[PDB]
Amino acid sequence: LWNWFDITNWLWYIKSLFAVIIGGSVGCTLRWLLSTKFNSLLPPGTLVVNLLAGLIIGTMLAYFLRQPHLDPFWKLMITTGLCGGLSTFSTFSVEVFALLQAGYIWALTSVLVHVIGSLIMTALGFFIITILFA
């Protein structure tokens, strides 16, 4: 069959694609909601989704390291799909310069808050998961 090795490789990549398609088409949706409804109020919609994605993928770094072997499929759709669609580096970058071009204390507060908080979310996730069943 027209090079079986390549047929099977491509079909596998197609499963692994379908995976990311679904994971990301949900992860993005969630962020769209939180941003549109909670950016009108240091915009917290695009910050809520970043903190949440940090927490999830930080729960799953300790998970897919001490609890692997179950499937790569769901790993991929949960990491580089859900936590990529829910997260963003761009919508956070726009508002920083939207504070810069306007004129510098909250443009640096955006930087610091975003980075340190979405990191402490990864910390929360990792230590929650590893402590849960240590």
Partner: antibody, heavy 131, light 109 residues
Framework: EVRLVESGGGLVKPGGSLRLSCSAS????????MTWVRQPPGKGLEWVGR??????????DYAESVKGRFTISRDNTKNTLYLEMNNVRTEDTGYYFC??????????????????????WGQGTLVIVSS | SELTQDPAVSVALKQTVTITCRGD??????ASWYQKKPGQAPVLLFY???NRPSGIPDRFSGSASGNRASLTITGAQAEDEADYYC????????????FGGGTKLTVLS
């Protein structure tokens, strides 16, 4: 219908050479993946090697204990499979079976390169290797 | 032998027995089960997710999990007293195929 007959086994001293042949019939031979499998006397089956089909460029993969010493080939016109055994070790004693090799890959659970199976077998051919 | 079986196992007549093969590749690839009587050729019995080729009675059924696979014989018969071999890849992602040690089934008759 589907028939596979091996031929050309027998006695041969260590270091010799021999050609086992598999006459194939009753299916599209020109495209079927083919596999050799030998059973030493009082042992289990051991996959020897497998030549691919037309889509793969007639690639052949060999069991490690055999790689470098055995050569698989095919005449799609004469409809026969060939195993050339050169520089023999007494290990290679046993019956030798050619098998039509189905290919399998379930789309959702799969992992390349799938997994091959052996639907149709010959009856064997005995190669003895002793001084 | 990355594929590992228990060498011998028996069962009484009309009962049910299961041969279990184990190995790394078994987690990422399916298997194929072959019956083998002395002198007689190997007989494909099952492979993949749920493929039982035509002719093989309904009583033969393959199974797969974690790193193990298993052939299930339901309703033992004296004409099943044979050798049984699993077959899969040697490692995950190889074109090289490999058989297990084999399992000697006695049908206590």
């Amino acid at each position: 219908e589907v028939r596979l007959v091996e031929s050309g086994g027998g006695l041969v001293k260590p270091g010799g050479s021999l050609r086992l042949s598999c006459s194939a019939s009753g299916f599209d031979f020109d495209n079927a993946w083919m596999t050799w499998v030998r059973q030493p006397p009082g042992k289990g089956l051991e996959w020897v090697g497998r030549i691919t089909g037309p889509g793969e460029g007639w690639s052949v993969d060999y069991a490690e204990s055999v790689k470098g010493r055995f050569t698989i080939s095919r005449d799609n016109t004469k409809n026969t499979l060939y195993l050339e055994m050169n520089n023999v070790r007494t290990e290679d004693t046993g019956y030798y079976f050619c098998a039509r090799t189905g290919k399998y890959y379930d789309f959702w659970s799969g992992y390349p390169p799938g997994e091959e199976y052996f639907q149709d077998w010959g009856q064997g051919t005995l190669v003895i290797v002793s001084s | 032998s990355e594929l590992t079986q228990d060498p011998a196992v028996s069962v009484a007549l009309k009962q049910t027995v299961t041969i279990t093969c184990r190995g790394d590749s078994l987690r990422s690839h399916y298997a194929s089960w072959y019956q083998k009587k002395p002198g007689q050729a190997p007989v494909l019995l099952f492979y993949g997710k749920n493929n039982r080729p035509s002719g093989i009675p309904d009583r033969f059924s393959g199974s797969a999990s974690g790193n193990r696979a298993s052939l299930t014989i339901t309703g033992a018969q004296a004409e099943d007293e044979a050798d049984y071999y699993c077959s899969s890849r040697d490692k995950s992602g190889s074109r090289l195929s490999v058989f297990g040690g084999g399992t000697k089934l006695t049908v206590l008759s």
